[PDB]
């Protein structure tokens, strides 16, 4: 052990010195001079009220109009956000669903949770009813997050501490990503889908090459578990939210923290994170039942979404930036402008 | 708006099925089942009835339906997956009450569950299981309990005790000492948001389903009286 542990500690120190050698400013200095986001009011333009239990996750279709949402009642519901119509309600095999996704085509949705299986549902059936196309069984702990790259491959995250990439036709792990030490909580794909990033109950986030199966970079600075992660829209920075009540932003290229988002009266964990289409706003969903909108350059609180009676569990901004939706343990979703 | 009118009508057809399911979701009771590796909960589920990440056991008593969730293939770091069960009617925690050194680990698990911030509202039904083995070990005199619980010799059987006919003074002191070691935890940080319901139970007793039914009836009475402002 020891002879390699000294090289590991030397390399950790060398990497910290390399990050520090690149720290020729801070993003707070670079953005000190620019005008702030003037404080943003947003109003609940729709409320979606069908679910029987706590919403755990939601995701937008690429059309910016349909969204899918999952809850512990054991249902997905697909919502036409413009009309508030329920487009489908899908009965799940396990009540304890924790995650939800669309395929970018809108042809499929995916689930996972405390039954470790990722289940994929086909929406465009000849038979008219939605049904499970495949069950991806090989994970050995709960699924925390799923994201489709295309209709034939999905990346997934688990309490078994692995991420994995699957081929949907085969039902098989095409790659497995193993460097995390705690339960992996969330994923986000880069805009090109060549890279993804994930955070994992050990205060660290990892960047991965989808196409190589290796960790490329590791990020640290959190005091506690990372729950939420999201790429900044340019695809070379990302932000995280955690039980230490900080959001934090990192570059890939400078390979370190740029900004911390916190306020002294915000004492509680962050469940979810997302960006506006310009990247200028972070949106973060919290315990204490509300969302804070942040100027993602200046780190001011630019506004609040106040509409939830229980824990905000998820966020998503539409692909055209035309709205944000919030989901909650109060069993509603609310859509904002 | 002819297609939109038909889309709204099928949205109403979905809402009918959601309200039909709201009835069964309200009517059924959901029970998180927990315990050590050596716990006998895998036998309790059969008493209830008669890589997979979770198991649902279905049973009913007096036409009231129970779903019991035994959390399956997961790691020993519950602090994330446990948050799902912030809904449940009760937790059921099952222990080999069988004089193990490992009884201290079961007390550490019970303390970790009872004090979890996501479980502040949730009652624990507590099964001190395999007490046939506790009786055999203590009646044989091969029980060691004071040797690693260094207060059993100072502890003595409470007037709360109601032993079964013919149970030995040592057997009865032992079961109630172990019972009180769990209650010494629950009474410390419990504040009337949640209550602990201890039982003594064995690999074959039929009453486990009744113990659950009676204790959810109690938990629901306490919830109803709280909503009425009467408790």
């Amino acid at each position: 052990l020891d002879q390699l542990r000294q090289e590991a500690e030397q390399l950790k120190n060398q990497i910290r010195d390399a990050r520090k050698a690149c720290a020729d400013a801070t993003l707070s200095q670079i953005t000190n001079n620019i005008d702030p986001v003037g404080r943003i009011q947003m109003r609940t333009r729709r409320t979606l009220r069908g679910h029987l239990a706590k919403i755990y996750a939601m995701h937008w279709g690429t059309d910016s109009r349909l969204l899918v949402s999952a809850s512990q009642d054991g249902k997905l519901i697909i919502w036409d956000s413009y009309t508030t119509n329920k487009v489908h309600a899908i009965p799940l095999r396990s009540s304890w669903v924790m995650t939800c996704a669309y395929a970018p085509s809108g042809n499929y949705v995916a689930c996972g949770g405390l039954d470790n299986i990722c289940s994929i549902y086909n929406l465009k059936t000849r038979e008219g009813n939605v049904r499970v196309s495949r069950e991806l069984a090989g994970h050995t702990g709960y699924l925390s997050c799923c994201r489709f790259l295309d209709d034939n491959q999905i990346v997934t995250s688990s309490g078994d501490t692995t991420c994995a990439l699957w081929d949907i036709e085969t039902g098989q792990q095409t790659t497995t990503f193993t460097g995390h030490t705690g339960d992996v909580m969330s994923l986000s794909l880069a805009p090109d889908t060549r890279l993804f990033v994930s955070g994992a109950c050990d205060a660290s986030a990892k960047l991965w090459d989808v196409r190589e199966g290796m960790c490329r970079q590791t990020f640290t600075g959190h005091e506690s578990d990372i729950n939420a992660i999201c790429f900044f829209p340019n695809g070379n920075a990302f932000a995280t939210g955690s039980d230490d009540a900080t959001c934090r932003l990192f570059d890939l290229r400078a390979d370190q923290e740029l900004m911390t988002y916190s306020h002294d009266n915000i004492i509680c964990g962050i469940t979810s994170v997302s960006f506006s289409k310009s990247g200028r706003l972070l949106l973060a969903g919290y315990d204490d039942f509300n969302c804070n909108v942040w100027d993602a350059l200046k780190a001011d609180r630019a506004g609040v979404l106040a509409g939830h009676d229980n824990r905000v569990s998820c966020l998503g901004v539409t692909d055209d930036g035309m709205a944000v939706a919030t989901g909650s343990w109060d069993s509603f979703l609310k859509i904002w402008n | 708006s002819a297609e939109d009118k038909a889309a709204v009508e099928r949205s109403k057809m979905i809402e009918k099925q959601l309200q039909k399911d709201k009835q069964v979701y309200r009517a059924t009771h959901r029970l998180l089942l927990l315990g050590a590796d050596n716990s006998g909960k895998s036998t309790i589920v059969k008493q209830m009835r008669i890589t997979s990440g979770i198991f649902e056991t279905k049973f009913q008593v007096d036409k009231v339906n129970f779903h019991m969730f035994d959390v399956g293939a997961q790691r020993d770091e519950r602090r994330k997956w446990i948050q799902c069960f912030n809904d449940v009617t009760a937790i059921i925690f099952v222990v080999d009450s069988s004089d193990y050194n490992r009884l201290q680990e079961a007390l550490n698990d019970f303390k970790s569950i009872w004090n979890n911030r996501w479980l502040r509202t949730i009652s624990v039904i507590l099964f001190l299981n395999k007490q046939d083995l506790l009786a055999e070990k203590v009646l044989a005199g091969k029980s060691k309990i004071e040797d690693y619980f260094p207060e059993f010799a100072r502890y003595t059987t409470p007037e709360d005790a109601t032993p079964e006919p013919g149970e030995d003074p040592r057997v009865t002191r032992a079961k109630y000492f172990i019972r009180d070691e769990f209650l010494r935890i629950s009474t410390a940080s419990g504040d009337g948001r949640h209550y602990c319901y201890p039982h003594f139970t064995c690999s074959v007793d039929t009453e486990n389903a009744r113990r659950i039914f009676n204790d959810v009836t109690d938990i629901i009475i306490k919830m109803n009286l709280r909503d009425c402002g009467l408790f």
Partner: single-chain antibody, 231 residues
Framework: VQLVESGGGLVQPGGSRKLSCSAS????????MHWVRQAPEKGLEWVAY????????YYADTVKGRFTISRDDPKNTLFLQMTSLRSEDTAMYYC??????????????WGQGTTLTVSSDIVMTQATSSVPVTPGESVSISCRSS???????????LYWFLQRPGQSPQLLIY???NLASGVPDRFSGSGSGTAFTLTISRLEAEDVGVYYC?????????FGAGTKLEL
């Protein structure tokens, strides 16, 4: 997927008949159903509709009160009851599938039809009645409506169907731009919202048949007279 009509044949005019249609290999309860006439050597004519779960019913004025449409979801079955009949009623009657939600394609599947032989509206017009042409050539077919089919939601409720000789109709396009599933990429459609075009990038022998436009902006549903393509 199948729809199979039954009943039909000879009727004396003042008498009555019941058509049935039997569905299989699809979730019948989820679909609204339409019946459509085709009088001998003439164009299509919609008669009746029922929603998913029977919540809405509509008729054409030529049949309102005189015919009634009814359903049996437990038996995947549809009916039409013909209370009194005319020389006006001899037609093939097609049973037709539809489902309504955002991005759905109604009218996507049609039964084989059954023949019955007897012993404002939006007016829809096609300027063409036949076009003589050969394989590999490109063509356009055009249709026009007395009211604009562009709704304020941004949909354009124009449907295009092909019927080949001896077949029932097939959906090509469901709203002007939207190509059906399982049809060649060779077909494409567009329009002004009051006049419309279906285009074929290059013909094949499988394109020989009659092309019907239809509106779905409001009931009663109305077809154009239908344009033949001939070799």
């Amino acid at each position: 997927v199948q729809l199979v009509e039954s009943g039909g044949g000879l009727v004396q005019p003042g008498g009555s008949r019941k058509l049935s249609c039997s569905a299989s290999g699809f979730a019948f309860s989820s679909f609204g159903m339409h019946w459509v006439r085709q009088a001998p050597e003439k164009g299509l004519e919609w008669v009746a509709y029922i929603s998913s779960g029977s919540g809405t019913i509509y008729y054409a004025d030529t049949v309102k009160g005189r015919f009634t449409i009814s359903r049996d979801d437990p038996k995947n079955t549809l009916f039409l009851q013909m209370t009194s009949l005319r020389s006006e009623d001899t037609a093939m009657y097609y049973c037709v599938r539809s489902i309504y939600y955002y991005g759905s394609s109604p009218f996507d599947f049609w039964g084989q039809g059954t023949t019955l032989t007897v012993s404002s509206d939006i007016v829809m017009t096609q300027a063409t009645s036949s076009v003589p042409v050969t394989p590999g050539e490109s063509v356009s077919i055009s249709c026009r409506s007395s009211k604009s089919l562009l709704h304020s939601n941004g949909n354009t409720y124009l449907y295009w169907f092909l019927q080949r000789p001896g077949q029932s109709p097939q959906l090509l396009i469901y709203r002007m731009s939207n190509l059906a599933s399982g049809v060649p990429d060779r077909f494409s459609g567009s329009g002004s919202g009051t006049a419309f075009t279906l285009t074929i990038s290059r013909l094949e022998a499988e394109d020989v048949g009659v092309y019907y436009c239809m509106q779905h902006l409001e009931y009663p549903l109305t077809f154009g007279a239908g344009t033949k393509l001939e070799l």
